[PDB]
Amino acid sequence: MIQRTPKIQVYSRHPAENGKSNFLNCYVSGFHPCDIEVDLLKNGERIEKVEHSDLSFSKDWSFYLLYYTEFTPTEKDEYACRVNHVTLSQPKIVKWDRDM
Amino acid sequence: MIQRTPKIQVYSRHPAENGKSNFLNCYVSGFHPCDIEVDLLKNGERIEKVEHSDLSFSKDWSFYLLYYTEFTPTEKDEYACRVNHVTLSQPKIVKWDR
């Protein structure tokens, strides 16, 4: 497989509501090679106990990986996913759109 | 060292009986880093139609990956698993033994 840079989706499990518990997700996909670093951020700082799936792929070694954690959004807090990969010269930061 | 060379096991789901439908498996495990190439081979040639698990994280910080394929063995056909990994000087071929 050739080098391929990741696609990134950030989304919550349920329709977001301030003060209500939820799950925050970062899905990284279509990438190669498999080594990748992903943080979920709250107000720009790393969230510590985030979990992830295994590395999925179909016919080719083009990889798919989900990072997720419980969270309770509030009006003041903003969330993001930060991804580093060999294809990336600097970390890529994708903000969470509240509507997703 | 955090690099770990893959353990490679090649085995059929049932013991070998020419003519009966079976499964060929290559279980590659205990490796680090995750970057790896695994191919199932029939007579030295890559089998195009194969199945596999996720490339999976172990509790000891290593990885594993299973490749498998439906096949029907015969007396002539020979099978192997080829694995390439940073810890190996050249691709490693491990033959299947009935």
Residue numbers in the entry:
A (entry chain A): 0 to 99
B (entry chain D): 0 to 97
Please quote the authors directly.
Physiologically, β2m is degraded in the kidneys; DRA patients typically suffer from kidney dysfunction that results in β2m accumulation in the serum following dialysis. Following our previous approach, in the present study we engineered a β2m homodimer where the DD strand interface is specifically locked by a disulphide bond (linking the engineered C33 residues of two β2m molecules – DimC33). Therefore, the unprompted dimerization of S33C implies that in solution, under native conditions, the DD association interface spontaneously brings together two monomeric β2m molecules, and only once the DD interface is properly assembled, the two facing Cys33 establish the disulphide bond, which results in the formation of the covalent dimeric species (DimC33). In summary, our study presents an engineered β2m covalent dimer, DimC33, displaying the same biophysical properties of wt β2m in solution, such dimer mimics the first oligomer formed during β2m aggregation.
In order to assess fine details of the molecular structure of DimC33, two crystal structures of DimC33 were determined to 1.9 Å and 1.4 Å resolution, hereafter named DimC33_low and DimC33_high, respectively; additionally a crystal structure of DimC33 in complex with ThT was determined to 2.8 Å resolution, and named DimC33_ThT. The three crystal structures display three different space groups and crystal packings. Overall, no major structural effects on the β2m fold are induced by the S33C mutation, either locally or globally, in all DimC33 structures. The covalent DD strand interface is structurally well conserved in all three DimC33 structures, where it maintains the same contact surface of 560 Å2. It must be noted that wide intermolecular packing contacts through the ABDE sheet are established also in the absence of ThT. In the structure of DimC33_low (present work) and in the hexameric H13F mutant17, highly hydrophobic association interfaces are built via facing ABDE sheets (surface areas of 805 and 970 Å2, respectively). Although such two ABDE assemblies are not superposable, the two interfaces are structurally similar and residues Tyr10, Tyr26 and Tyr63 are clustered in their hydrophobic cores. Notably, an extended ABDE interface between facing β2m molecules can also be observed in the absence of ThT in DimC33_low (this work), and in the hexameric β2m structure reported earlier. The reciprocal orientation of the two facing ABDE β-sheets displays a high level of variability, but in all cases ABDE β-sheets face each other and the same three aromatic residues (Tyr10, Tyr26 and Tyr63) build the hydrophobic core of the association interface.
